[PDB]
Amino acid sequence: NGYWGYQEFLDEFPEQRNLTNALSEAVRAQPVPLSKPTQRPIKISVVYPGQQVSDYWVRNIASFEKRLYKLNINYQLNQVFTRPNADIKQQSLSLMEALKSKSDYLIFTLDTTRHRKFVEHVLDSTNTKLILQNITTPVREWDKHQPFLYVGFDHAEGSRELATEFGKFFPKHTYYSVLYFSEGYISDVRGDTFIHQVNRDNNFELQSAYYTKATKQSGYDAAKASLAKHPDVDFIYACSTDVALGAVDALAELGREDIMINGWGGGSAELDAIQKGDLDITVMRMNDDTGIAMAEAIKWDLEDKPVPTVYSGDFEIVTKADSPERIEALKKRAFRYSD
Ligand SMILES: OC[C@]12OC[C@H](O)[C@H]1O[B-](O)(O)O2
């Protein structure tokens, strides 16, 4: 809403579908170093959220840097971390701070319904080229000047896949509860998608939905509260890794192994929980592809080639029944750079 669907957007602009497809080919393919030399090293800023159970961000940067090295790109990387739970006001402060650096590229994430126009005005202000992480759905308003790249693993797709699995695990009319992220974009695209699908297709009944602070502790708290008010459910759908892992501790504490719970993203900690059996299911994203895509995107730009506006990587579904070999194989695929 105010957003294009990833696939919708690629349909509407064929040239974009081409560029994105070309890029995915450039990601799958072996590194091809930089065609066009530079006058100086390029300066890149990263404003990321810190201290999360989720290893997505650190892995992203890892695979990113490794790719830039492989491409023979000479970069200087200024990192900044936001402590938690950093207010959106604080995050955007960290952001303005990173803008002073007058970098060539600026990689970051910010909730883009709660700070739509802010980011728009930032886009208008600088010559720094923006990379928006963790959003794969372009904003309609910004068709005049879109950022350099939205990069991520489509939230709607991953939530569709999970909805598809839950419809597979349970009868029509099954009771469940939902643990959202914080109020915002992510909860809208991960949560409300899942709920829409599961209500329409499987006639599931949503007992309750709770917002969180996007932290493990918060996930624990919200799970406890929710199950206190609404004990009778067959699963809980969680919108992020940290919240899921908190909810697990809650379900253990409460003795509720009659309740099923999913992860989101399938990083190391989730996979470990899946192998313990603490986590019933997850949608594991092929993590490093987006780190590698950003480096390929920068390469092109420096060769003066056109760059796609968006890139989404792919998911696989992982269940606690999967073989160690399949898990291992998927790690081989997903962390092929960050290990
Ligand atoms: O992609 C990163 C992320 O999205 C929200 C949160 O920051 C992370 O937790 B997650 O569930 O692993 O996915």
mmCIF file with all atom_site columns, all heavy atoms in Angstrom, residues 49 52 54 56-57 134 155 181 186 190 239-242 264-265 270 285, ligand 1:
data_model
loop_
_atom_site.group_PDB
_atom_site.id
_atom_site.type_symbol
_atom_site.label_atom_id
_atom_site.label_alt_id
_atom_site.label_comp_id
_atom_site.label_asym_id
_atom_site.label_entity_id
_atom_site.label_seq_id
_atom_site.pdbx_PDB_ins_code
_atom_site.Cartn_x
_atom_site.Cartn_y
_atom_site.Cartn_z
_atom_site.occupancy
_atom_site.B_iso_or_equiv
_atom_site.pdbx_formal_charge
_atom_site.auth_seq_id
_atom_site.auth_comp_id
_atom_site.auth_asym_id
_atom_site.auth_atom_id
_atom_site.pdbx_PDB_model_num
ATOM   1   N N   . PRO A 1 49  ? 21.387 -1.993  12.400 1.00 0.00 ? 49  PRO A N   1
ATOM   2   C CA  . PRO A 1 49  ? 20.944 -2.247  13.769 1.00 0.00 ? 49  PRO A CA  1
ATOM   3   C C   . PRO A 1 49  ? 21.893 -3.245  14.401 1.00 0.00 ? 49  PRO A C   1
ATOM   4   O O   . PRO A 1 49  ? 22.350 -4.157  13.715 1.00 0.00 ? 49  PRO A O   1
ATOM   5   C CB  . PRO A 1 49  ? 19.571 -2.890  13.564 1.00 0.00 ? 49  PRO A CB  1
ATOM   6   C CG  . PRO A 1 49  ? 19.741 -3.638  12.293 1.00 0.00 ? 49  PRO A CG  1
ATOM   7   C CD  . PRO A 1 49  ? 20.576 -2.738  11.426 1.00 0.00 ? 49  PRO A CD  1
ATOM   8   N N   . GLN A 1 52  ? 21.618 -8.068  17.635 1.00 0.00 ? 52  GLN A N   1
ATOM   9   C CA  . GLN A 1 52  ? 20.433 -8.849  17.388 1.00 0.00 ? 52  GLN A CA  1
ATOM   10  C C   . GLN A 1 52  ? 20.854 -10.300 17.418 1.00 0.00 ? 52  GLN A C   1
ATOM   11  O O   . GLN A 1 52  ? 22.018 -10.606 17.183 1.00 0.00 ? 52  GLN A O   1
ATOM   12  C CB  . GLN A 1 52  ? 19.839 -8.467  16.039 1.00 0.00 ? 52  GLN A CB  1
ATOM   13  C CG  . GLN A 1 52  ? 18.688 -7.482  16.137 1.00 0.00 ? 52  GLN A CG  1
ATOM   14  C CD  . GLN A 1 52  ? 18.096 -7.124  14.779 1.00 0.00 ? 52  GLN A CD  1
ATOM   15  O OE1 . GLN A 1 52  ? 18.690 -7.386  13.750 1.00 0.00 ? 52  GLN A OE1 1
ATOM   16  N NE2 . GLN A 1 52  ? 16.922 -6.517  14.780 1.00 0.00 ? 52  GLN A NE2 1
ATOM   17  N N   . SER A 1 54  ? 19.690 -12.324 15.296 1.00 0.00 ? 54  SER A N   1
ATOM   18  C CA  . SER A 1 54  ? 19.719 -12.505 13.858 1.00 0.00 ? 54  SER A CA  1
ATOM   19  C C   . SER A 1 54  ? 21.067 -12.077 13.271 1.00 0.00 ? 54  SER A C   1
ATOM   20  O O   . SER A 1 54  ? 21.494 -10.967 13.517 1.00 0.00 ? 54  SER A O   1
ATOM   21  C CB  . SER A 1 54  ? 18.608 -11.639 13.271 1.00 0.00 ? 54  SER A CB  1
ATOM   22  O OG  . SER A 1 54  ? 18.387 -11.896 11.907 1.00 0.00 ? 54  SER A OG  1
ATOM   23  N N   . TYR A 1 56  ? 21.814 -11.742 10.146 1.00 0.00 ? 56  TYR A N   1
ATOM   24  C CA  . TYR A 1 56  ? 21.601 -11.285 8.778  1.00 0.00 ? 56  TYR A CA  1
ATOM   25  C C   . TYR A 1 56  ? 22.518 -10.114 8.383  1.00 0.00 ? 56  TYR A C   1
ATOM   26  O O   . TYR A 1 56  ? 23.170 -10.143 7.342  1.00 0.00 ? 56  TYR A O   1
ATOM   27  C CB  . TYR A 1 56  ? 20.133 -10.927 8.576  1.00 0.00 ? 56  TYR A CB  1
ATOM   28  C CG  . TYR A 1 56  ? 19.802 -10.353 7.212  1.00 0.00 ? 56  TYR A CG  1
ATOM   29  C CD1 . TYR A 1 56  ? 19.607 -11.176 6.101  1.00 0.00 ? 56  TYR A CD1 1
ATOM   30  C CD2 . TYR A 1 56  ? 19.646 -8.984  7.037  1.00 0.00 ? 56  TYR A CD2 1
ATOM   31  C CE1 . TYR A 1 56  ? 19.296 -10.642 4.852  1.00 0.00 ? 56  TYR A CE1 1
ATOM   32  C CE2 . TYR A 1 56  ? 19.331 -8.446  5.795  1.00 0.00 ? 56  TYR A CE2 1
ATOM   33  C CZ  . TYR A 1 56  ? 19.161 -9.278  4.702  1.00 0.00 ? 56  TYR A CZ  1
ATOM   34  O OH  . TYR A 1 56  ? 18.849 -8.729  3.467  1.00 0.00 ? 56  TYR A OH  1
ATOM   35  N N   . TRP A 1 57  ? 22.589 -9.109  9.243  1.00 0.00 ? 57  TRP A N   1
ATOM   36  C CA  . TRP A 1 57  ? 23.291 -7.861  8.978  1.00 0.00 ? 57  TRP A CA  1
ATOM   37  C C   . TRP A 1 57  ? 24.803 -8.054  8.910  1.00 0.00 ? 57  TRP A C   1
ATOM   38  O O   . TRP A 1 57  ? 25.457 -7.647  7.928  1.00 0.00 ? 57  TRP A O   1
ATOM   39  C CB  . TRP A 1 57  ? 22.894 -6.871  10.056 1.00 0.00 ? 57  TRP A CB  1
ATOM   40  C CG  . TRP A 1 57  ? 21.382 -6.768  10.166 1.00 0.00 ? 57  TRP A CG  1
ATOM   41  C CD1 . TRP A 1 57  ? 20.559 -7.459  11.032 1.00 0.00 ? 57  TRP A CD1 1
ATOM   42  C CD2 . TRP A 1 57  ? 20.516 -5.949  9.360  1.00 0.00 ? 57  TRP A CD2 1
ATOM   43  N NE1 . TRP A 1 57  ? 19.243 -7.106  10.813 1.00 0.00 ? 57  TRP A NE1 1
ATOM   44  C CE2 . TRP A 1 57  ? 19.190 -6.186  9.792  1.00 0.00 ? 57  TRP A CE2 1
ATOM   45  C CE3 . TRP A 1 57  ? 20.736 -5.033  8.332  1.00 0.00 ? 57  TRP A CE3 1
ATOM   46  C CZ2 . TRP A 1 57  ? 18.092 -5.541  9.213  1.00 0.00 ? 57  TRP A CZ2 1
ATOM   47  C CZ3 . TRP A 1 57  ? 19.658 -4.396  7.770  1.00 0.00 ? 57  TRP A CZ3 1
ATOM   48  C CH2 . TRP A 1 57  ? 18.348 -4.653  8.209  1.00 0.00 ? 57  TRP A CH2 1
ATOM   49  N N   . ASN A 1 134 ? 16.530 -4.626  3.397  1.00 0.00 ? 134 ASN A N   1
ATOM   50  C CA  . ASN A 1 134 ? 15.384 -5.272  4.041  1.00 0.00 ? 134 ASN A CA  1
ATOM   51  C C   . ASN A 1 134 ? 14.032 -4.728  3.523  1.00 0.00 ? 134 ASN A C   1
ATOM   52  O O   . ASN A 1 134 ? 13.013 -4.856  4.167  1.00 0.00 ? 134 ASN A O   1
ATOM   53  C CB  . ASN A 1 134 ? 15.512 -5.118  5.544  1.00 0.00 ? 134 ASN A CB  1
ATOM   54  C CG  . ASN A 1 134 ? 14.931 -6.274  6.310  1.00 0.00 ? 134 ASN A CG  1
ATOM   55  O OD1 . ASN A 1 134 ? 14.745 -7.369  5.787  1.00 0.00 ? 134 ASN A OD1 1
ATOM   56  N ND2 . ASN A 1 134 ? 14.665 -6.037  7.606  1.00 0.00 ? 134 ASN A ND2 1
ATOM   57  N N   . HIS A 1 155 ? 9.542  -10.027 1.785  1.00 0.00 ? 155 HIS A N   1
ATOM   58  C CA  . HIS A 1 155 ? 8.820  -10.415 2.989  1.00 0.00 ? 155 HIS A CA  1
ATOM   59  C C   . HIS A 1 155 ? 7.525  -11.129 2.617  1.00 0.00 ? 155 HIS A C   1
ATOM   60  O O   . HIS A 1 155 ? 7.161  -12.151 3.224  1.00 0.00 ? 155 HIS A O   1
ATOM   61  C CB  . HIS A 1 155 ? 8.507  -9.197  3.841  1.00 0.00 ? 155 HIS A CB  1
ATOM   62  C CG  . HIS A 1 155 ? 9.713  -8.402  4.249  1.00 0.00 ? 155 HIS A CG  1
ATOM   63  N ND1 . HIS A 1 155 ? 10.719 -8.913  5.039  1.00 0.00 ? 155 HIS A ND1 1
ATOM   64  C CD2 . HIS A 1 155 ? 10.053 -7.120  3.991  1.00 0.00 ? 155 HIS A CD2 1
ATOM   65  C CE1 . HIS A 1 155 ? 11.638 -7.981  5.230  1.00 0.00 ? 155 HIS A CE1 1
ATOM   66  N NE2 . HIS A 1 155 ? 11.258 -6.885  4.602  1.00 0.00 ? 155 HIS A NE2 1
ATOM   67  N N   . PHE A 1 181 ? 6.328  -7.889  14.619 1.00 0.00 ? 181 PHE A N   1
ATOM   68  C CA  . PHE A 1 181 ? 7.488  -7.083  14.859 1.00 0.00 ? 181 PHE A CA  1
ATOM   69  C C   . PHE A 1 181 ? 6.994  -5.826  15.554 1.00 0.00 ? 181 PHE A C   1
ATOM   70  O O   . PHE A 1 181 ? 5.903  -5.827  16.135 1.00 0.00 ? 181 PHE A O   1
ATOM   71  C CB  . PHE A 1 181 ? 8.059  -6.734  13.521 1.00 0.00 ? 181 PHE A CB  1
ATOM   72  C CG  . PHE A 1 181 ? 9.481  -6.387  13.536 1.00 0.00 ? 181 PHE A CG  1
ATOM   73  C CD1 . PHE A 1 181 ? 10.435 -7.339  13.783 1.00 0.00 ? 181 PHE A CD1 1
ATOM   74  C CD2 . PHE A 1 181 ? 9.877  -5.114  13.237 1.00 0.00 ? 181 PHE A CD2 1
ATOM   75  C CE1 . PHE A 1 181 ? 11.779 -7.009  13.753 1.00 0.00 ? 181 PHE A CE1 1
ATOM   76  C CE2 . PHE A 1 181 ? 11.193 -4.790  13.186 1.00 0.00 ? 181 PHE A CE2 1
ATOM   77  C CZ  . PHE A 1 181 ? 12.149 -5.741  13.448 1.00 0.00 ? 181 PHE A CZ  1
ATOM   78  N N   . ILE A 1 186 ? 7.609  -3.832  8.468  1.00 0.00 ? 186 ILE A N   1
ATOM   79  C CA  . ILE A 1 186 ? 7.890  -5.252  8.565  1.00 0.00 ? 186 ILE A CA  1
ATOM   80  C C   . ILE A 1 186 ? 6.662  -6.039  9.034  1.00 0.00 ? 186 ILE A C   1
ATOM   81  O O   . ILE A 1 186 ? 6.330  -7.053  8.451  1.00 0.00 ? 186 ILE A O   1
ATOM   82  C CB  . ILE A 1 186 ? 9.128  -5.519  9.431  1.00 0.00 ? 186 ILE A CB  1
ATOM   83  C CG1 . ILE A 1 186 ? 10.354 -4.889  8.749  1.00 0.00 ? 186 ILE A CG1 1
ATOM   84  C CG2 . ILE A 1 186 ? 9.329  -7.021  9.659  1.00 0.00 ? 186 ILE A CG2 1
ATOM   85  C CD1 . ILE A 1 186 ? 11.093 -5.813  7.788  1.00 0.00 ? 186 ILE A CD1 1
ATOM   86  N N   . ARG A 1 190 ? 5.161  -8.827  6.643  1.00 0.00 ? 190 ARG A N   1
ATOM   87  C CA  . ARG A 1 190 ? 5.334  -10.183 7.125  1.00 0.00 ? 190 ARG A CA  1
ATOM   88  C C   . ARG A 1 190 ? 4.105  -10.719 7.833  1.00 0.00 ? 190 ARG A C   1
ATOM   89  O O   . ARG A 1 190 ? 3.817  -11.900 7.729  1.00 0.00 ? 190 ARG A O   1
ATOM   90  C CB  . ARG A 1 190 ? 6.514  -10.270 8.097  1.00 0.00 ? 190 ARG A CB  1
ATOM   91  C CG  . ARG A 1 190 ? 7.845  -10.192 7.440  1.00 0.00 ? 190 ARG A CG  1
ATOM   92  C CD  . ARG A 1 190 ? 8.923  -10.651 8.344  1.00 0.00 ? 190 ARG A CD  1
ATOM   93  N NE  . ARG A 1 190 ? 10.224 -10.382 7.736  1.00 0.00 ? 190 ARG A NE  1
ATOM   94  C CZ  . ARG A 1 190 ? 11.407 -10.544 8.339  1.00 0.00 ? 190 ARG A CZ  1
ATOM   95  N NH1 . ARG A 1 190 ? 11.497 -10.988 9.588  1.00 0.00 ? 190 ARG A NH1 1
ATOM   96  N NH2 . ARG A 1 190 ? 12.517 -10.250 7.681  1.00 0.00 ? 190 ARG A NH2 1
ATOM   97  N N   . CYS A 1 239 ? 7.038  -12.898 13.529 1.00 0.00 ? 239 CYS A N   1
ATOM   98  C CA  . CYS A 1 239 ? 7.451  -12.115 12.357 1.00 0.00 ? 239 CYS A CA  1
ATOM   99  C C   . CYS A 1 239 ? 8.930  -11.867 12.270 1.00 0.00 ? 239 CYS A C   1
ATOM   100 O O   . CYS A 1 239 ? 9.386  -11.250 11.327 1.00 0.00 ? 239 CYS A O   1
ATOM   101 C CB  . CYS A 1 239 ? 6.731  -10.776 12.296 1.00 0.00 ? 239 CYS A CB  1
ATOM   102 S SG  . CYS A 1 239 ? 4.999  -10.961 11.990 1.00 0.00 ? 239 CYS A SG  1
ATOM   103 N N   . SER A 1 240 ? 9.686  -12.374 13.228 1.00 0.00 ? 240 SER A N   1
ATOM   104 C CA  . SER A 1 240 ? 11.127 -12.229 13.177 1.00 0.00 ? 240 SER A CA  1
ATOM   105 C C   . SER A 1 240 ? 11.798 -13.238 14.083 1.00 0.00 ? 240 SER A C   1
ATOM   106 O O   . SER A 1 240 ? 11.192 -13.809 14.996 1.00 0.00 ? 240 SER A O   1
ATOM   107 C CB  . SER A 1 240 ? 11.537 -10.818 13.556 1.00 0.00 ? 240 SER A CB  1
ATOM   108 O OG  . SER A 1 240 ? 11.313 -10.580 14.933 1.00 0.00 ? 240 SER A OG  1
ATOM   109 N N   . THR A 1 241 ? 13.072 -13.445 13.786 1.00 0.00 ? 241 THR A N   1
ATOM   110 C CA  . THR A 1 241 ? 13.968 -14.318 14.529 1.00 0.00 ? 241 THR A CA  1
ATOM   111 C C   . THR A 1 241 ? 14.022 -14.087 16.060 1.00 0.00 ? 241 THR A C   1
ATOM   112 O O   . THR A 1 241 ? 13.821 -15.014 16.850 1.00 0.00 ? 241 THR A O   1
ATOM   113 C CB  . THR A 1 241 ? 15.396 -14.128 13.972 1.00 0.00 ? 241 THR A CB  1
ATOM   114 O OG1 . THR A 1 241 ? 15.430 -14.537 12.605 1.00 0.00 ? 241 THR A OG1 1
ATOM   115 C CG2 . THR A 1 241 ? 16.437 -14.913 14.808 1.00 0.00 ? 241 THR A CG2 1
ATOM   116 N N   . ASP A 1 242 ? 14.320 -12.866 16.483 1.00 0.00 ? 242 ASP A N   1
ATOM   117 C CA  . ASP A 1 242 ? 14.457 -12.598 17.895 1.00 0.00 ? 242 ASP A CA  1
ATOM   118 C C   . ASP A 1 242 ? 13.146 -12.887 18.635 1.00 0.00 ? 242 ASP A C   1
ATOM   119 O O   . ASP A 1 242 ? 13.128 -13.553 19.680 1.00 0.00 ? 242 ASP A O   1
ATOM   120 C CB  . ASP A 1 242 ? 14.914 -11.149 18.101 1.00 0.00 ? 242 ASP A CB  1
ATOM   121 C CG  . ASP A 1 242 ? 16.399 -10.937 17.776 1.00 0.00 ? 242 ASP A CG  1
ATOM   122 O OD1 . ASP A 1 242 ? 16.913 -11.580 16.840 1.00 0.00 ? 242 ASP A OD1 1
ATOM   123 O OD2 . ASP A 1 242 ? 17.051 -10.113 18.436 1.00 0.00 ? 242 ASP A OD2 1
ATOM   124 N N   . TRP A 1 264 ? 11.915 -16.907 11.132 1.00 0.00 ? 264 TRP A N   1
ATOM   125 C CA  . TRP A 1 264 ? 11.839 -16.069 9.941  1.00 0.00 ? 264 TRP A CA  1
ATOM   126 C C   . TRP A 1 264 ? 13.228 -15.626 9.454  1.00 0.00 ? 264 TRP A C   1
ATOM   127 O O   . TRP A 1 264 ? 13.825 -14.747 10.043 1.00 0.00 ? 264 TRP A O   1
ATOM   128 C CB  . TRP A 1 264 ? 10.971 -14.843 10.225 1.00 0.00 ? 264 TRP A CB  1
ATOM   129 C CG  . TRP A 1 264 ? 10.021 -14.536 9.119  1.00 0.00 ? 264 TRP A CG  1
ATOM   130 C CD1 . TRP A 1 264 ? 8.667  -14.638 9.139  1.00 0.00 ? 264 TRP A CD1 1
ATOM   131 C CD2 . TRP A 1 264 ? 10.375 -14.083 7.816  1.00 0.00 ? 264 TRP A CD2 1
ATOM   132 N NE1 . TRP A 1 264 ? 8.149  -14.265 7.916  1.00 0.00 ? 264 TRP A NE1 1
ATOM   133 C CE2 . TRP A 1 264 ? 9.180  -13.922 7.100  1.00 0.00 ? 264 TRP A CE2 1
ATOM   134 C CE3 . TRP A 1 264 ? 11.589 -13.792 7.198  1.00 0.00 ? 264 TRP A CE3 1
ATOM   135 C CZ2 . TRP A 1 264 ? 9.177  -13.476 5.795  1.00 0.00 ? 264 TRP A CZ2 1
ATOM   136 C CZ3 . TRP A 1 264 ? 11.581 -13.358 5.906  1.00 0.00 ? 264 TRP A CZ3 1
ATOM   137 C CH2 . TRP A 1 264 ? 10.384 -13.206 5.212  1.00 0.00 ? 264 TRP A CH2 1
ATOM   138 N N   . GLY A 1 265 ? 13.741 -16.237 8.387  1.00 0.00 ? 265 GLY A N   1
ATOM   139 C CA  . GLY A 1 265 ? 15.035 -15.857 7.848  1.00 0.00 ? 265 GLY A CA  1
ATOM   140 C C   . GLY A 1 265 ? 16.048 -16.979 7.837  1.00 0.00 ? 265 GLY A C   1
ATOM   141 O O   . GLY A 1 265 ? 16.947 -17.015 6.991  1.00 0.00 ? 265 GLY A O   1
ATOM   142 N N   . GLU A 1 270 ? 18.538 -19.793 14.253 1.00 0.00 ? 270 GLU A N   1
ATOM   143 C CA  . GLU A 1 270 ? 17.290 -20.453 13.914 1.00 0.00 ? 270 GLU A CA  1
ATOM   144 C C   . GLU A 1 270 ? 17.622 -21.869 13.561 1.00 0.00 ? 270 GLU A C   1
ATOM   145 O O   . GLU A 1 270 ? 16.984 -22.796 14.060 1.00 0.00 ? 270 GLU A O   1
ATOM   146 C CB  . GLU A 1 270 ? 16.544 -19.751 12.779 1.00 0.00 ? 270 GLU A CB  1
ATOM   147 C CG  . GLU A 1 270 ? 15.769 -18.510 13.221 1.00 0.00 ? 270 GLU A CG  1
ATOM   148 C CD  . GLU A 1 270 ? 14.735 -18.038 12.205 1.00 0.00 ? 270 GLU A CD  1
ATOM   149 O OE1 . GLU A 1 270 ? 14.463 -18.757 11.226 1.00 0.00 ? 270 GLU A OE1 1
ATOM   150 O OE2 . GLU A 1 270 ? 14.173 -16.949 12.397 1.00 0.00 ? 270 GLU A OE2 1
ATOM   151 N N   . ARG A 1 285 ? 16.407 -17.858 4.237  1.00 0.00 ? 285 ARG A N   1
ATOM   152 C CA  . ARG A 1 285 ? 16.755 -17.141 3.046  1.00 0.00 ? 285 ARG A CA  1
ATOM   153 C C   . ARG A 1 285 ? 18.202 -17.438 2.651  1.00 0.00 ? 285 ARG A C   1
ATOM   154 O O   . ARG A 1 285 ? 19.019 -17.729 3.497  1.00 0.00 ? 285 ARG A O   1
ATOM   155 C CB  . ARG A 1 285 ? 16.403 -15.674 3.217  1.00 0.00 ? 285 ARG A CB  1
ATOM   156 C CG  . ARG A 1 285 ? 17.236 -14.916 4.129  1.00 0.00 ? 285 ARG A CG  1
ATOM   157 C CD  . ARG A 1 285 ? 16.479 -13.760 4.842  1.00 0.00 ? 285 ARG A CD  1
ATOM   158 N NE  . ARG A 1 285 ? 17.118 -13.594 6.150  1.00 0.00 ? 285 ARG A NE  1
ATOM   159 C CZ  . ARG A 1 285 ? 16.549 -13.117 7.245  1.00 0.00 ? 285 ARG A CZ  1
ATOM   160 N NH1 . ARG A 1 285 ? 15.312 -12.661 7.228  1.00 0.00 ? 285 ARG A NH1 1
ATOM   161 N NH2 . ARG A 1 285 ? 17.244 -13.087 8.364  1.00 0.00 ? 285 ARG A NH2 1
HETATM 162 O O1  . LIG B 2 .   ? 16.164 -9.312  7.666  1.00 0.00 ? 1   LIG B O1  1
HETATM 163 C C1  . LIG B 2 .   ? 16.422 -9.025  8.987  1.00 0.00 ? 1   LIG B C1  1
HETATM 164 C C2  . LIG B 2 .   ? 15.284 -9.415  9.836  1.00 0.00 ? 1   LIG B C2  1
HETATM 165 O O2  . LIG B 2 .   ? 14.233 -8.530  9.538  1.00 0.00 ? 1   LIG B O2  1
HETATM 166 C C3  . LIG B 2 .   ? 13.841 -7.940  10.769 1.00 0.00 ? 1   LIG B C3  1
HETATM 167 C C4  . LIG B 2 .   ? 14.908 -8.178  11.715 1.00 0.00 ? 1   LIG B C4  1
HETATM 168 O O3  . LIG B 2 .   ? 15.790 -7.111  11.685 1.00 0.00 ? 1   LIG B O3  1
HETATM 169 C C5  . LIG B 2 .   ? 15.628 -9.332  11.209 1.00 0.00 ? 1   LIG B C5  1
HETATM 170 O O4  . LIG B 2 .   ? 15.203 -10.476 11.851 1.00 0.00 ? 1   LIG B O4  1
HETATM 171 B B1  . LIG B 2 .   ? 14.932 -11.410 10.858 1.00 0.00 ? 1   LIG B B1  1
HETATM 172 O O5  . LIG B 2 .   ? 13.689 -12.057 11.204 1.00 0.00 ? 1   LIG B O5  1
HETATM 173 O O6  . LIG B 2 .   ? 16.000 -12.363 10.754 1.00 0.00 ? 1   LIG B O6  1
HETATM 174 O O7  . LIG B 2 .   ? 14.851 -10.724 9.595  1.00 0.00 ? 1   LIG B O7  1
#
